[PDB]
Amino acid sequence: SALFEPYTLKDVTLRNRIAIPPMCQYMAEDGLINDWHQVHYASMARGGAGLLVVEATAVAPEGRITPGCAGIWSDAHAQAFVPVVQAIKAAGSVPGIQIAHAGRKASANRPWEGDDHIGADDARGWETIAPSAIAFGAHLPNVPRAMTLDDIARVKQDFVDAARRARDAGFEWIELHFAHGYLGQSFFSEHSNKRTDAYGGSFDNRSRFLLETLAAVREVWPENLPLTARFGVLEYDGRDEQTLEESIELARRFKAGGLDLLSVSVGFTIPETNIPWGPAFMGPIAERVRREAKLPVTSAWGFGTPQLAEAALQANQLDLVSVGRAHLADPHWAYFAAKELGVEKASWTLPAPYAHWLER
Amino acid sequence: SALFEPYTLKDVTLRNRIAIPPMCQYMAEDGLINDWHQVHYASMARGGAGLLVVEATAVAPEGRITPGCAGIWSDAHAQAFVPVVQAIKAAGSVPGIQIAHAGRKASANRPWEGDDHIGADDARGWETIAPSAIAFGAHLPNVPRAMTLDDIARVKQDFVDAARRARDAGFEWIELHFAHGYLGQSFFSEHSNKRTDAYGGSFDNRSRFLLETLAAVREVWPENLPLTARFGVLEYDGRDEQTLEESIELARRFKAGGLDLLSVSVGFTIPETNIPWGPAFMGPIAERVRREAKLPVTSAWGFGTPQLAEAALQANQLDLVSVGRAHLADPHWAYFAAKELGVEKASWTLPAPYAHWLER
Ligand SMILES: Cc1cc2nc3c(=O)[nH]c(=O)nc-3n(C[C@H](O)[C@H](O)[C@H](O)COP(=O)(O)O)c2cc1C
Ligand SMILES: Cc1cc2nc3c(=O)[nH]c(=O)nc-3n(C[C@H](O)[C@H](O)[C@H](O)COP(=O)(O)O)c2cc1C
Ligand SMILES: CCOC(=O)/C(=N\O)C(=O)CC
Ligand SMILES: CCOC(=O)/C(=N\O)C(=O)CC
Ligand SMILES: CCOC(=O)/C(=N\O)C(=O)CC
Ligand SMILES: [Cl-]
Ligand SMILES: [Cl-]
């Protein structure tokens, strides 16, 4: 089974090709994770996945999506991740973390508490920042403040500090969150970036924030640990061919800048889109990015059955299959996939106190 | 669905009829549980089961099965359980504990490390005790030391102390381990009990250790929390009709002694048996105990599919369905069962950070 072959990138070896992608839990308080996260992450790591990327973790307080989002904007915030790192490693999985800034989608309610922008009367909210003073729309109507040059320098340094803290906390894999309509994605997209300075307009200028942030993080992130990013390569906004071509060129510049793997996603920059949701629907797009930019990739959004994950690897569409919601349903999903694909000694995907009895 | 109806016993209300039976993890050190257990138990409790009975926990060091077994023979051992108790409760499940003494089956290797009696050359072994100096045989050939009346008094007091410690740790449900061929079962069975004093021979005498231990525990266990026991009611040794009749009479005496629920199991007192393993094969035996002793029951050993669990409840065979190995495979099995049985808003079997996404 291709799904259960190990994968080596820089000095890190994953025991299989199953990655748990970042999934916000909305259970932190003042950015600090707690017993929710400790058990959540440890249980999934014991389930057998080879890589576990911790949820979007804000580089600055205003970069959280919600009041429940994790943060890493202080050393004390970073130290709270140490037992999560330890538990993931103890289970034989590789600990990664996604560092993030929500941009104009920030200051929102938890998804089961309205999922919309916090009203201006509500003291839980905060002012959001973005390349330009333009609202997402729909359920996110708040207009962000357009960033100053000093804001751009500060946020870049916040990403550096977050990567420094993630390194010192023992993470072995980092993912810059440049996707899903948050700050980095919104610098790249012409929908959201109307700047007239060095950070908007041309392709070079719209790329600048992402390339400079990658370069700044590269200075503090160890050479021997994978440096990755998530990036929305099309929007399904009727501009897909032109957008994909530009996104793939940016991926080439990421590779020149030391990026080791690209998590290929959808932009979600604006609500006026027509996304063709379906099983493994990102497969062909990830394959094109992988082949044309000559960069290893992962993707998600419907690969969460064992046969779909296996097929995507054999078709050379992905190097790692990211399986999200199936791991919320069943934290031992990797063991379920091993059984379904007929792996030999499939129960030993799990630690001995489970594996011994499930082999029978 | 009957499986998802709440259940009230004394002052305790379980949110459904799914119980997780005690399952030894063999991961403790010198009786102290650790982060293996913390994550293991918290994850299963978040999975939705209404009751979680913690694994066989030894009332005395020589009452462990293996060097990996949990213990509660000191106050420090009991304090180690407090975070487990509190995590189970935080998940909305009810924390129980089975307190145990392995008798002649003690001083054994972990199941994935030979599963047999520890060799006399090995620095990990200890002297075992039992009603009579007779070995189990097979992979457990060590001859135990026959208990004196002083030993009987001491072991009873060890159960009392363990119950008091479980109470102060916050457990809301206790199970005395009188099953599976360990100390309590071995006093009841004529196979292992050849005593000639007040604790062997007649039915009254063979029952005496179990009834006296129950009565001693009842003095310190709160009247408003369920007091239960697990008991092997037959052996599949060619003596089943007489043995089950005696076992059911003992259940009547347990009820008169204040027992609130019986976990009905197989004796496993000797190796020379022919157990007819099959799906829900204990159903009819548990039904007979429940009806004839007029006492609530649970049972296990093959009820771990949603339809079998539902059928057993609808047939009035059980009051709670214990589902063990299926929760090792999938800590969220209760959610899987709610989906299979078509429960309304089945995903909200799980906490919101999972439920919100699995609904859609
Ligand atoms: C609860 C939840 C939280 C998510 N949080 C993040 C996140 O923090 N960062 C991110 O890039 N994507 C996030 N996403 C997207 C997932 O990483 C993934 O792409 C998505 O679940 C699709 O994969 P799946 O079909 O296997 O679930 C989240 C998705 C869910 C359901
Ligand atoms: C790993 C494991 C540990 C067990 N530990 C205990 C125990 O500590 N006490 C006990 O009474 N039974 C124990 N048993 C029996 C279970 O409680 C249960 O009766 C058995 O797993 C059958 O139910 P199932 O078919 O749902 O797995 C254990 C079983 C397993 C597989
Ligand atoms: C078809 C709709 O496209 C738009 O008007 C747009 N950007 O171009 C926005 O949504 C602003 C948030
Ligand atoms: C619209 C797609 O957005 C996501 O997948 C997501 N949460 O749902 C994140 O990226 C949180 C940082
Ligand atoms: C074969 C019957 O014995 C059991 O189920 C068991 N572990 O497997 C225990 O009771 C541990 C105390
Ligand atoms: Cl751990
Ligand atoms: Cl429930």
mmCIF file of C-alpha atoms in Angstrom, chain B residues 1-8 14-20 48-51 290 296-299 309-310 313 316 318-323 333:
data_model
loop_
_atom_site.group_PDB
_atom_site.id
_atom_site.type_symbol
_atom_site.label_atom_id
_atom_site.label_comp_id
_atom_site.label_asym_id
_atom_site.label_seq_id
_atom_site.Cartn_x
_atom_site.Cartn_y
_atom_site.Cartn_z
ATOM 1 C CA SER B 1 -33.026 4.144 20.206
ATOM 2 C CA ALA B 2 -32.883 2.167 23.448
ATOM 3 C CA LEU B 3 -29.078 2.369 23.374
ATOM 4 C CA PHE B 4 -29.300 6.149 23.712
ATOM 5 C CA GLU B 5 -31.855 6.354 26.521
ATOM 6 C CA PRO B 6 -30.430 7.690 29.811
ATOM 7 C CA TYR B 7 -30.126 5.439 32.854
ATOM 8 C CA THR B 8 -30.409 6.415 36.524
ATOM 9 C CA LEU B 14 -25.758 8.049 32.561
ATOM 10 C CA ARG B 15 -26.500 9.869 29.307
ATOM 11 C CA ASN B 16 -26.972 6.583 27.381
ATOM 12 C CA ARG B 17 -26.724 2.811 27.861
ATOM 13 C CA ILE B 18 -23.196 2.448 26.433
ATOM 14 C CA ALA B 19 -20.689 1.434 29.097
ATOM 15 C CA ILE B 20 -16.949 1.047 28.562
ATOM 16 C CA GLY B 48 -19.800 9.660 24.004
ATOM 17 C CA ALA B 49 -20.121 6.551 26.199
ATOM 18 C CA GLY B 50 -22.275 7.238 29.243
ATOM 19 C CA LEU B 51 -20.137 5.247 31.694
ATOM 20 C CA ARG B 290 -31.398 -10.304 35.520
ATOM 21 C CA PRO B 296 -29.909 -4.797 36.851
ATOM 22 C CA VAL B 297 -27.085 -6.256 34.774
ATOM 23 C CA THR B 298 -24.550 -5.499 32.095
ATOM 24 C CA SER B 299 -22.509 -7.930 30.032
ATOM 25 C CA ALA B 309 -26.348 -3.675 21.466
ATOM 26 C CA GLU B 310 -29.752 -2.244 20.559
ATOM 27 C CA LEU B 313 -31.609 -3.803 25.390
ATOM 28 C CA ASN B 316 -34.577 -6.813 28.199
ATOM 29 C CA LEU B 318 -29.263 -6.042 29.790
ATOM 30 C CA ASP B 319 -29.662 -2.590 31.311
ATOM 31 C CA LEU B 320 -26.308 -1.362 30.000
ATOM 32 C CA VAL B 321 -24.287 -2.707 27.087
ATOM 33 C CA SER B 322 -20.537 -2.922 27.738
ATOM 34 C CA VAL B 323 -18.486 -2.346 24.572
ATOM 35 C CA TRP B 333 -17.472 4.279 18.930
#
